[PDB]
Design a binder for this molecule. Structure first.
Ligand SMILES: O=c1ccn([C@@H]2O[C@H](COP(=O)(O)OP(=O)(O)O)[C@@H](O)[C@H]2O)c(=O)[nH]1
Ligand SMILES: [Hg+2]
Ligand SMILES: [Hg+2]
Ligand SMILES: [Hg+2]
Ligand SMILES: [Hg+2]
Ligand SMILES: [Hg+2]
Ligand SMILES: [Mn+2]
Length: 262
């Protein structure tokens, strides 16, 4: 059940003015593509806060990657879901190497040692740890299932996408299929949908391994197969995982929100 929004004062949406004339802002299956200029964050914050939304943010930090956790968490504190309930889950082989990072109110961190989500959070966001937040990443992303446009491929034709191309792999996508090339480094959704996805990818990877084949881009290849056959209900623009060193700051990006660390 959803309670009413309060009175709010904001600019009227303009039916005869496009949000953007330079980019696609809705997919052919009517999922929004999230770019700066498309959303009013005050409206969305109200909607999600009224639901007391809790967001889980999951990161793996194994071996040398524990080195990335301090900048990742400190910047998440500044930029990720500020105002909302956040639960970070850090999966690591080195629990004692996790940095002591000061968290805002309503935000918590669990360290899980590696060799429940359903009761604790509403959405799960799964990201690589060698990254840092530089600008707002908020409730605009939340939806049952989302993927993010890979920054090297957002302007490419589908034939250039580096999908798995061998028919022998569960991850196979032929040259005449494919909407986008999604990044393995940043996807999420409701807990139920993320667990569906990871279960499907895990089963497909086991089949591939039993068959002697490893997809060309591993988890990312399988994510792209899944999102081909189960269309995401939002797609994030490359604002959401950019690489400024590799790719600069092109005019189509009004904000650089979350970026690879060198
Ligand atoms: O030795 C490793 C290798 C990778 N990872 C995790 O797996 C992700 C994927 O590897 P990485 O991001 O370095 O590869 P990329 O695709 O960015 O080059 C990393 O961000 C970490 O979250 C890790 O924890 N330890
Ligand atoms: Hg707009
Ligand atoms: Hg995850
Ligand atoms: Hg999959
Ligand atoms: Hg997998
Ligand atoms: Hg996957
Ligand atoms: Mn990475």
């Amino acid at each position: 059940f959803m309670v009413s929004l309060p009175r709010m004062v904001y600019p009227q949406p303009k039916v005869l003015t496009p949000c953007r004339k330079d980019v696609l802002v809705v997919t052919p299956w009517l999922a929004p593509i999230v770019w700066e200029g498309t959303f009013n964050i005050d409206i969305l914050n109200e909607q999600f806060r009224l639901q007391n939304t809790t967001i889980g943010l999951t990161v793996f930090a194994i071996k040398k990657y524990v080195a990335f956790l301090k900048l990742f968490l400190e910047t998440a504190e500044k930029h990720f879901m500020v105002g909302h309930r956040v639960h970070y889950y850090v999966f690591t082989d080195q629990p004692a190497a996790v940095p002591r990072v000061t968290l805002g109110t309503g935000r918590q961190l669990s360290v899980l040692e590696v060799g429940r989500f359903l009761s604790e959070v509403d959405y799960l966001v799964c990201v690589d740890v060698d990254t840092e937040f530089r600008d707002h990443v908020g409730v605009e992303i939340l939806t049952p299932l989302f993927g993010t446009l890979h920054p090297s491929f957002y302007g490419s034709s589908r034939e250039a996408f580096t999908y798995e191309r061998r028919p022998q792999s569960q991850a196979y996508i032929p040259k005449d299929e494919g909407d986008f090339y999604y990044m393995g480094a940043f996807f999420g959704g409701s807990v139920q949908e993320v667990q569906r996805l990871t279960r499907a990818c895990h089963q497909a990877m086991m089949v591939d391994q039993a068959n002697g084949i490893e997809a060309v881009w591993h988890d990312e290849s399988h994510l792209n197969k899944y999102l081909l056959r189960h269309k995401p209900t939002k797609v994030l623009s490359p604002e959401y995982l950019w690489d400024q060193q590799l790719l600069g700051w092109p005019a189509v990006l009004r904000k650089l929100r979350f970026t690879a660390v060198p």
